[PDB]
């Protein structure tokens, strides 16, 4: 509708400078002219003009670290969920408004162009977005840090609903090019697979391996206004030229060339699984490929440091942990550990015992879940085929580890079979989480209950052996994408009262408590939320047609579709609402638009069945005339980072409904608290610290706490007891069973009825009473608007703890051994030396 | 050593302008700085700075044709052998010297950087290089012409000799990027495969096809100093997103994504075959893919022309031949013909008879060979699986064609089975050359004997039916790469006497005859050749170590290794030389370095065996002490366009030794005549017109003429008769048979002895006597240096006929119906309208 905001300055020389460079790239880069360029060409000409302001800083940030030679952080992760990069690069560079002006002054709309950029979807959900929020905070806090991963050609599938069913399609995100990466084929590295170990004379050598080459592509990562631009280096697999061709004595020339994309398949696609584990060979190859190439880049930069000069010299790998820290994001890069040992013992010739002290002191592991099927336990026959030397290192690590255990707990022979990194069973497997705790100096959970559960349940044997290792670092979100850029309106009215230093010191939001009774602030906070609701209701109407009423409670659950996340308990509530107004049509109920969005992993039949229940409820509710506009259900197609930047500011109610003790943290819950939505949720993961921060009175907690879940499981969850005692619940089960929601095919949901009734791992019926109760308490508050906005002002003013600048300042300090900083690096300026 | 030349002007503002843009791209494009850039970064910064001068001209040449709307030429070819693009773009743009200066003034050497560029090897030999010389001449003659083909990821294999054997390896030419193409993914098109024909109500429809998408990449093609920059558009195969993913009911998500490079395999690799024919499905798919996508681009530009406005209107495809001409380079794009019919009949709804008159008037075919196994005769079961509608069009074309034949030659029933486009036999096949003659309005050979042979032998039935169709257009070479850029020294001393207008009017070289007796010109011509010999002898010593004597006759044969090209007859001569000085060690013989280079198709066992004989002769000769430096044999590794630009200026003797009547033209023979080498050759292909142009006295013709070859075949070639009568020949056969040239393994060459003796298709022994005779006559002339240079001045001064500007001005005028031009298009300048 309008804006000016403090998206920086649009200064005279700079709007002019930009327009010129925009017209340059349209001509020289795009080789398009004004009468034939489309909005996409206009998008790339701006994308190149904005990366031009970034390269000078990138060049000097990288030479600056070469000169001062910090300890460098390597965040290894198999997922990095970046989303779009234009607006965020403008935010961090102070260019939002000058490019806005310049674009207006050239006849275009920035927002049109910004919507043309495709999302880099290299992540599934939470862990991958966490990696992306960390890179932002590591650059903003001036750390010499590098994100490393795989440059996947096809990120997470684009979801389409066809006839209410998920239909998945390839995310060919590079179809049109990527203006942000810089291929660096001169730095390609080999990564070896298969092979043998020959033991001769002095050590093992891994021989007759097949070679795949790792080609890197660097994406710049600019901090918020401090002239630090760090590097995300993503590897692409490339077939060699000789082996992937010469080995001869007939087998087709053309075939040998066509078979190269077989080795180049290691980076073809992101594995699409939220909280599960696929024991597939392609996957372990992707995991070894990023570990292998990354560790060669690490050692390379260490060998220069300044030791490649002196410092001491006589290759004292002794200082390797005082120059490198590698952060294992989950067990996906756990081969960082036998691979660092392999180079150090086999190739570099240190003794096992020096090389183990160097490995544990440089590695650290972040654990992201408790659910047992997410755990990676790779079968031994896979590792001995593919990586025979690393299996051999893992059996000697295992050996020496359990000799410490038995020395520490003598006679405790079941502990020994429980701590082992080798799981006997039909299929003997390697427990990768165990590897990680054994060869890392610090282990951490992503929220205070999650970290307490690890010590108390899942890794108690390991805590008793090395208590000092276990740590907690509650997750965070970046105030730059998740507030300044998806919600410029809410950021200006905060910046009007308290200024802008909160964008890199989010704890300042607390100074907003003073305005909880300021009627100018209550109306502005309330005007921003209604604005966002109108802009999203229009988006809905435009891009997807649907039309919803902007004057309802916008009830939204957006996250991957998993049973533990409980989209089914939300469904049970909307069917209740439906039925309470079918019995009393003429009772006023507060009207709500309830929006559920998220992706189902492709062969997870329950998740795909839950998307078909949600679109089935919307087919009834959205077409009943007695309901009118009072209730609508909307399934939010193709949830991804850029859609989250649209919906979360338009949210009034955030659904954070997991069975207590299953969500390790969640970070979507945080994004929704900085953007003026209220939380209804169980005491799970970080919802606990969030309510502790806003006060439980300012939060709508319901349900079973974890204690209660353990009592229910000692007792035995019988779901028939909830059916027998709750008539509103009896009735829903029977409407699902008789085809009410699937007329033409009545039995269609009996998979879901049989499950809820007989195999509910996540106790949906047990939290049902307390949850429709709690849901009556939020509707009661919504219809007294000024007391809703005051509860909202108490949530927003208490979001500070949940910034990734705090989480990363705590990894920096208590795990990596670096001090953060905000002192801006010298101004971008010229000087070619 | 030195140069200045007239490689254009290095003017004050321009050397400055260039240095600046070089430093810009190193920083902003390369994101490298001065202390860390390698010669490759320096190469790309210049490559981008030179394409910046090209885009303004390209943009305005393409909008200029949209405004005047010429008849446009489409040169469809499956091969385009471009070589490197930097120096040639500098030549044609007048930038050679300013960039030379600027680079010197920035501390680098241009020649170092220019050697870093990888050759675009999208061709096998002659036909592919012809396409590349034509594009240059079509732009220089200001024609609105477009080269169309496949953007192959892997061009022709890089050859390596290991132990004297060819070893082939992938040409991953895009490893480092290509600064010259511009991807245009917004213009992707579908190309359909497989399917069915349903006949309903009004016509056939091709239904249930699989879809592959064609992504184009445009390379600019600048004419020699006329501000026309035309377009080579090369298609890349891309899998669709929905079909290459959705078709469901289980078959793996990850698999569906990995299987996309199966459809993207259509442009993965160039088929590596010189003069043979592979009936492989991948190949017909590449042939349909370029026809399909090209014809959609053709029709698109025709539908705008100005008819998409009016001109008349009521879609009078009537004017389609007065606006389009498509040139079939060989039968590889022959499906241009049932595909143009298919769109016009099926999709566009014209009657068969209007659509056939429009097809023949727009298509024309260039025939490139006579050897029967080069002929494409695709088996019917392939075409009915893959392209069922086009087979159906080819059977109705066939039908109506033979009804004309039978009407014209009534009762002549064997003519009917000979002209048929459908070859009955065990495997019924379609004769694609026949398709081409039936649906083209003009057919041509590539040299006056080759064109006479078509009328007289291979297509006599077709000439008697439509005599008016057959034409000749002798091949040419471009004076810009093949003289101005590989031989700047020879071009300045010509330009010193006669000026520079000869570079686009090569017939002016005749004014050099006046200097055949000018002792200043004889010494300069002779100094340039000795310079080139020293620069190549150093190259040899550097890049490949070898060391040859620059004071010998440099005897060179460079071309693909085929039996008809007769590398074996040259080998028989060098073994003779060897043996004549083994019998008389102390006779002075004129010393020669004989260099044979060329690639063997991978499973052509004779060609691979001929490369092993040549490296085997060099192992003896090059290590005999009695020979001294008097004779050396050098196998020239990885012959390709950029190596041809090195060797051909260093050549004294050109070997053009094919059995008369087998080489259709040859164009290497021409390149060698403009660069001061003398030809020893048979009366074959264009060697006939070349000797007719220089006078037979100035040429060293030997051997059997085609008449004589027919008499020998009527009689019966018995090779034992030549063995019995020629002792020097008896002796070589026995040295090959007894392991003289393969000691450790004696029988190693008996494949080649058995062949020469019993299965010689190309009569090597019959031309042996006359050829060692003729070879004694060139050594006699070499040792009287001033009379060699005068014969050389008479060859160089008579090269004019062999320019592709003359060949293309004759296609323009007598086949396409366009007038050439040299009037430079307006100066590059700015103006964004
Ligand atoms: O991989 P390293 O060497 O750390 O970093 C690489 O990329 C940076 C960023 O442009 C260059 O400054 C550096 O010289 C290059 F080698
Ligand atoms: O990546 P997904 O599985 O969505 O998310 C996982 O990791 C994130 C980030 O630590 C946690 O918040 C979440 O509790 C867990 F389930
Ligand atoms: O394929 P056509 O349209 O002929 O040509 C295409 O590329 C040229 C060269 O930049 C543009 O001027 C033109 O507008 C575009 F559409
Ligand atoms: O492409 P290759 O097979 O080398 O060459 C073929 O076509 C060229 C170009 O017309 C002819 O000169 C040659 O005689 C023929 F054999
Ligand atoms: C933040 C984010 C997530 C995480 O959501 P949770 O509710 O914590 O599971 C998932 N997907 C996207 C697109 C995100 O923005
Ligand atoms: C000119 C050229 C050819 C053609 O040589 P011929 O002797 O005509 O067969 C083949 N390869 C390259 C690299 C060329 O330059």
Swiss-Prot record, chains A, B:
* Record-annotated site: Involved in the association of subunits: 99, 133
User: What superkingdom heads the lineage?
Assistant: Eukaryota
Q: Which CDD domains does the UniProt entry name for this protein?
A: GT35_Glycogen_Phosphorylase
**Single GO molecular function:** glycogen phosphorylase activity
The modified positions for N6-(pyridoxal phosphate)lysine read 671
Q: Where is this site: Can be labeled by an AMP analog?
A: 146
One GO process term, biological-process aspect:
glycogen catabolic process
Q: How does it assemble?
A: Homodimer. Homotetramer; to form the enzymatically active phosphorylase A.
Protein name, entry field: Glycogen phosphorylase, muscle form
Q: Gene name on record?
A: PYGM
């Amino acid at each position: 509708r309008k804006q000016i905001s403090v998206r920086g300055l649009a200064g005279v020389e700079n709007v002019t400078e930009l327009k010129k460079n925009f017209n340059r790239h349209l001509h020289f880069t795009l080789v398009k002219d004004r009468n034939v360029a489309t909005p996409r060409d206009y998008y790339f000409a701006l994308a190149h003009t904005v990366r031009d302001h970034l390269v000078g800083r990138w060049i000097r940030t990288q030479q600056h670290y070469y000169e001062k030679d910090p300890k460098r952080i390597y965040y290894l992760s198999l997922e990095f969920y970046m989303g779009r990069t234009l607006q965020n690069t403008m935010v961090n560079l102070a260019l939002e408004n000058a490019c806005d002006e310049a674009t207006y002054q050239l006849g275009l709309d920035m927002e049109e162009l910004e919507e043309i950029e495709e999302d880099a979807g290299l992540g599934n959900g939470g862990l991958g977005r966490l990696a992306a929020c960390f890179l932002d905070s590591m650059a903003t806090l001036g750390l010499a840090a590098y994100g490393y991963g795989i440059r996947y050609e096809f990120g997470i599938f684009n979801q389409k609903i066809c006839g209410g069913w998920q239909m998945e399609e390839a995310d060919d995100w590079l179809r049109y090019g990527n203006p942000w990466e810089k291929a660096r084929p001169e730095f390609t590295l080999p990564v070896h697979f298969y092979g043998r170990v020959e033991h001769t004379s002095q050590g093992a050598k891994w021989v007759d391996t097949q070679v795949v080459l790792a080609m890197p592509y660097d994406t710049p990562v600019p901090g918020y206004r401090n002239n630090v631009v760090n590097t995300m280096r993503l590897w692409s697999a490339k077939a060699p030229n000789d082996f992937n061709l010469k080995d001869f004595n007939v087998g087709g020339y053309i075939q040998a060339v066509l078979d190269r994309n077989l080795a180049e398949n290691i980076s073809r696609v992101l594995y699409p699984n939220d909280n599960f584990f696929e024991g597939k060979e392609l996957r372990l190859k992707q995991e070894y490929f990023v570990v292998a190439a990354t560790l060669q880049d690490i050692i390379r930069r260490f060998k220069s440091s300044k030791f490649g000069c002196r410092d001491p010299v006589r290759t004292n790998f002794d200082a390797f942990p005082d120059k490198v820290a590698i952060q294992l994001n989950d067990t996906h890069p756990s081969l960082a550990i036998p691979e660092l040992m392999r180079v150090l013992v086999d190739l570099e010739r240190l003794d096992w015992d020096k090389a183990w002290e160097v490995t544990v002191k440089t590695c650290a592991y972040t654990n992201h879940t408790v659910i047992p099927e997410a755990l990676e336990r790779w079968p031994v026959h896979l590792l001995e085929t593919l990586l025979p030397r690393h299996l051999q290192i893992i059996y000697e690590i295992n050996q020496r580890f359990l000799n410490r255990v038995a020395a520490a707990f003598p006679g405790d022979v079941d502990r020994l079979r429980r701590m082992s990194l080798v799981e006997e069973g039909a299929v003997k497997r390697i427990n990768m989480a165990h590897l990680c705790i054994a060869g890392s100096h610090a282990v951490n959970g992503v929220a205070r209950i999650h970290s307490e559960i690890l010590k108390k349940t899942i890794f108690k044997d390991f805590y008793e052996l090395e208590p000092h290792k276990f740590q907690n670092k509650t997750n965070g979100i970046t105030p730059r994408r998740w507030l300044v850029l998806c919600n410029p309106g809410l950021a200006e009215i905060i910046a009007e009262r308290i200024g802008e230093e909160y964008i890199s010191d989010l704890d300042q939001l607390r100074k907003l408590l003073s305005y909880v009774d300021d009627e100018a602030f209550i109306r502005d906070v309330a005007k921003v939320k209604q604005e966002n609701k109108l802009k999203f209701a229009a988006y809905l109407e435009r891009e997807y047609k649907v039309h919803i009423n902007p004057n309802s409670l916008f009830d939204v659950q957006v996250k991957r579709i998993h049973e533990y996340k409980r989209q089914l308990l939300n469904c049970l509530h909307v069917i209740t609402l439906y039925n309470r107004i079918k019995k009393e049509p003429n009772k006023f109920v507060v009207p709500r638009t309830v929006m559920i969005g998220g992706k189902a992993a492709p062969g997870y039949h329950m998740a795909k069945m839950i998307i078909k229940l949600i679109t089935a409820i919307g087919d009834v509710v959205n077409h009943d005339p007695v309901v009118g506009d009072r209730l609508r259900v909307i399934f939010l197609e193709n949830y991804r980072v850029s859609l989250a930047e649209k919906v979360i500011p338009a949210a009034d109610l955030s659904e954070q409904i997991s069975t207590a003790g299953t969500e390790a943290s969640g970070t979507g819950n945080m994004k929704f608290m900085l953007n003026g939505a209220l939380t209804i949720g169980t005491m799970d993961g970080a919802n606990v610290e969030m309510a502790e921060e806003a006060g439980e009175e300012n939060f709508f907690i319901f349900g079973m706490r974890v204690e209660d879940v353990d009592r229910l499981d000692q007792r035995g969850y019988n779901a028939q007891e909830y059916y027998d005692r709750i008539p509103e619940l009896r009735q829903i089960i029977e409407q699902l069973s008789s085809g009410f929601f699937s007329p033409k095919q009545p039995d269609l949901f009996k998979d879901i009825v049989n499950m809820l009734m007989h195999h509910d791992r996540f106790k949906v019926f047990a939290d049902y009473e307390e949850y429709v109760k709690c849901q009556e308490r939020v509707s009661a508050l919504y219809k007294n608007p000024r007391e809703w906005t005051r509860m909202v002002i108490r949530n927003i003013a208490t979001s500070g703890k949940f910034s990734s600048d705090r989480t990363i300042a705590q990894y920096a300090r208590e795990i990596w051994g670096v001090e953060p900083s905000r002192q801006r690096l010298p101004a971008p300026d010229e000087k070619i030396p």
